[PDB]
Amino acid sequence: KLVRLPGLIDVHVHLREPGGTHKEDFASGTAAALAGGITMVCAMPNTRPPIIDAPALALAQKLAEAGARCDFALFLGASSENAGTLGTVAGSAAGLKLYLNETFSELRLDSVVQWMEHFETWPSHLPIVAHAEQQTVAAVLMVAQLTQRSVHICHVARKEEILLIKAAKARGLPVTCEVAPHHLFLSHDDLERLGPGKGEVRPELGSRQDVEALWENMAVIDCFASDHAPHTLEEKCGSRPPPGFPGLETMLPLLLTAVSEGRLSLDDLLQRLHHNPRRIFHLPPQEDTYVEVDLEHEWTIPSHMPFSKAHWTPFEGQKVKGTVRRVVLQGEVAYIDGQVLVPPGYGQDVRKWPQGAVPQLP
Amino acid sequence: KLVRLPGLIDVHVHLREPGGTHKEDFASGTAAALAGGITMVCAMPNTRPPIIDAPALALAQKLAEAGARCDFALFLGASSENAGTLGTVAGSAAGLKLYLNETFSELRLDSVVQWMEHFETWPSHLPIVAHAEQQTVAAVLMVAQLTQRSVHICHVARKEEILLIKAAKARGLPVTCEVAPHHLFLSHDDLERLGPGKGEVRPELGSRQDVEALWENMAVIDCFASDHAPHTLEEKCGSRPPPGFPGLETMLPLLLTAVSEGRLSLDDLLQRLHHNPRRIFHLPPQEDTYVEVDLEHEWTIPSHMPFSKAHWTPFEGQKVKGTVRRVVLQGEVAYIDGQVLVPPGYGQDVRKWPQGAVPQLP
Ligand SMILES: O=C(O)c1[nH]c(=O)[nH]c(=O)c1F
Ligand SMILES: O=C(O)c1[nH]c(=O)[nH]c(=O)c1F
Ligand SMILES: [Zn+2]
Ligand SMILES: [Zn+2]
Ligand SMILES: [Zn+2]
Ligand SMILES: [Zn+2]
């Protein structure tokens, strides 16, 4: 018997279009999403050009509307120049992403004062998410408190970070967070197999104690999100390997395996891949949309998944129990047993739906 | 300018049909819901006969399908006899309600062992909610831990209770809770005006310190829910006054006033009347459903609201800023400026929708 799930949401993907389409584009990345049981994605802004101004957002919107096979929202990215300039387009974005650790020059913030300025100028009712590692989690939480608003922490990867967030939540602070599958299912123990190129990711793979701490503190994790960060094997194995793993096609199989093993419940999974993404980012429901999964069939992750142009995966060799069998999106069969059946352009910008606008006071 | 809200959900109403229809029926209670900006309600099982077996649920389902003007789900109620007998109908109910303090004989549980039996036999993927006051909150939390599952605490009304729940959440325990408007906007200070009959409610009105504690610990409150508990003025002012307040028509105006005053944000309100009710009870979205409210218009709550057959309200005399102007339900105008425009029977049982079934493992 198949299990029917609602349309799952991944609030953290890199679809590389514009500017990196040999790694991934909207069409191939959203095919990977559908194959992973994901019917709506939020795409990060560190493209080339980066989505840091209204013209770049306008271009990305059209590229996504023409290429996406599932529904989507597009993040804006904070820069050292664009605080106080995004007000007219802010409501059309998934949210504002701050890169507070390593990034490309155009997204680099050189001073916490620049973080303050973004928290002060970005509309207070709209989401802010941050790449914020180790101490940076505490620092950006401080900025959120000074500006009296919420923040969402991307890919929490360390015992240090989840315990800090746990302490903040105990004090009633408005902070939510997401965890990516590689930080639950990979660790330092895998670096010998992966090698130093493939193993490059930010946040880096943690210790076994880091991984154990995230599982022990599942109650503190609001969302799962893949941080789908595709690069080709040539790039990952070359002289300056970029950080990141592809993950859309492997997320749900990995987590369904954990569910089968009693590590978390089916509800725990659906809170973290459906309900909490909806409520943190004010994402609308998807009419006549659902995912049918098979929890009985055991298989081994191969050297590459069928759809991501990354054409490699760090989870190769792991045994999983859980398969996406069928995806229905907006009343149409979008995916069945390895075949994507909706064309590029079938997906839509959920922020343009009346029910996708973020409610605000007049 | 009007503000567009999603369809709000009240997970705790008493609609009195069958058996108490002079107090309220499905048609009048759901009219009150729509006038309060509420498009889906979860109806408690302490009717006459109480909804404690499959035949009674079958009757209530038809009465609701014929009378409800908004969408709904129906709770089953725990009794001293029905543990282990509800398995075939459990998935069709909103959840299982346990009355752990005062109640009618048919819903009275005389031993914590009976609570254990319900937690052991009720399907583990389906909701359990409890009327659990003071120590009873800790006791039912203990039963939840022994049976390794979650519990939702109805109408938290005391500093003692919210602090206990706060401590449980800090330990990672799966507990959620709701707070009713009278415990945020009324207190002991109002008992002289109300009198001892009108003022009867369970949980009773709290001290100013209780009320202040709930506001201070808003982060711990998952849901708002009215505990709409209608009785006629004759009953409230008579020789054996039943406990309870009507509240569907006054909830949102009261909370919108608080939002206008900066006591909580619009998002805080929508998490507690839309997103968290959805995710705790696995309630489906409502297609083409939304509520338009006006935050500018000031008015004073009268001696009775237009629709509840209770025909009185404990909030008489309070000044509010916030009005439900229009409700659209499933693509039809359901309410405009005091006029309900959908007939009895327009509402449906959301648990019969494919997307309203609670996902479970095979
Ligand atoms: O875009 C990427 O590849 C990327 N990869 C990572 O591993 N971390 C990032 O923060 C990032 F932006
Ligand atoms: O049904 C009612 O009137 C009712 N009224 C209350 O004040 N508390 C209850 O727990 C209840 F079931
Ligand atoms: Zn990142
Ligand atoms: Zn990323
Ligand atoms: Zn009660
Ligand atoms: Zn009640």
Swiss-Prot record, chains A, B:
<feature type="binding site">
    <location>
        <position position="12"/>
    </location>
    <ligand>
        <name>Zn(2+) 2</name>
    </ligand>
</feature>
<feature type="active site" description="For DHOase activity">
    <location>
        <position position="227"/>
    </location>
</feature>
<feature type="binding site">
    <location>
        <position position="243"/>
    </location>
    <ligand>
        <name>(S)-dihydroorotate</name>
    </ligand>
</feature>
<comment type="similarity">
    <text>In the N-terminal section; belongs to the CarA family.</text>
</comment>
<protein>
    <recommendedName>
        <fullName>Multifunctional protein CAD</fullName>
    </recommendedName>
</protein>
<comment type="similarity">
    <text>In the 2nd section; belongs to the CarB family.</text>
</comment>
<feature type="binding site">
    <location>
        <position position="178"/>
    </location>
    <ligand>
        <name>Zn(2+) 2</name>
    </ligand>
</feature>
<feature type="binding site">
    <location>
        <position position="12"/>
    </location>
    <ligand>
        <name>Zn(2+) 1</name>
    </ligand>
</feature>
<comment type="function">
    <text>Multifunctional protein that encodes the first 3 enzymatic activities of the de novo pyrimidine pathway: carbamoylphosphate synthetase (CPSase; EC 6.3.5.5), aspartate transcarbamylase (ATCase; EC 2.1.3.2) and dihydroorotase (DHOase; EC 3.5.2.3). The CPSase-function is accomplished in 2 steps, by a glutamine-dependent amidotransferase activity (GATase) that binds and cleaves glutamine to produce ammonia, followed by an ammonium-dependent carbamoyl phosphate synthetase, which reacts with the ammonia, hydrogencarbonate and ATP to form carbamoyl phosphate.</text>
</comment>
<feature type="modified residue" description="N6-carboxylysine">
    <location>
        <position position="97"/>
    </location>
</feature>
<comment type="subunit">
    <text>Homohexamer. Interacts with CIPC.</text>
</comment>
<feature type="binding site">
    <location>
        <position position="202"/>
    </location>
    <ligand>
        <name>(S)-dihydroorotate</name>
    </ligand>
</feature>
<feature type="binding site">
    <location>
        <position position="131"/>
    </location>
    <ligand>
        <name>Zn(2+) 3</name>
    </ligand>
</feature>
<feature type="binding site">
    <location>
        <position position="16"/>
    </location>
    <ligand>
        <name>(S)-dihydroorotate</name>
    </ligand>
</feature>
<feature type="binding site" description="via carbamate group">
    <location>
        <position position="97"/>
    </location>
    <ligand>
        <name>Zn(2+) 3</name>
    </ligand>
</feature>
<feature type="binding site">
    <location>
        <position position="227"/>
    </location>
    <ligand>
        <name>Zn(2+) 1</name>
    </ligand>
</feature>
<feature type="binding site">
    <location>
        <position position="231"/>
    </location>
    <ligand>
        <name>(S)-dihydroorotate</name>
    </ligand>
</feature>
<feature type="binding site">
    <location>
        <position position="155"/>
    </location>
    <ligand>
        <name>Zn(2+) 3</name>
    </ligand>
</feature>
<feature type="binding site">
    <location>
        <position position="154"/>
    </location>
    <ligand>
        <name>Zn(2+) 2</name>
    </ligand>
</feature>
<feature type="binding site">
    <location>
        <position position="46"/>
    </location>
    <ligand>
        <name>(S)-dihydroorotate</name>
    </ligand>
</feature>
<feature type="binding site">
    <location>
        <position position="14"/>
    </location>
    <ligand>
        <name>Zn(2+) 1</name>
    </ligand>
</feature>
<feature type="region of interest" description="DHOase (dihydroorotase)">
    <location>
        <begin position="1"/>
        <end position="329"/>
    </location>
</feature>
<feature type="binding site" description="via carbamate group">
    <location>
        <position position="97"/>
    </location>
    <ligand>
        <name>Zn(2+) 1</name>
    </ligand>
</feature>
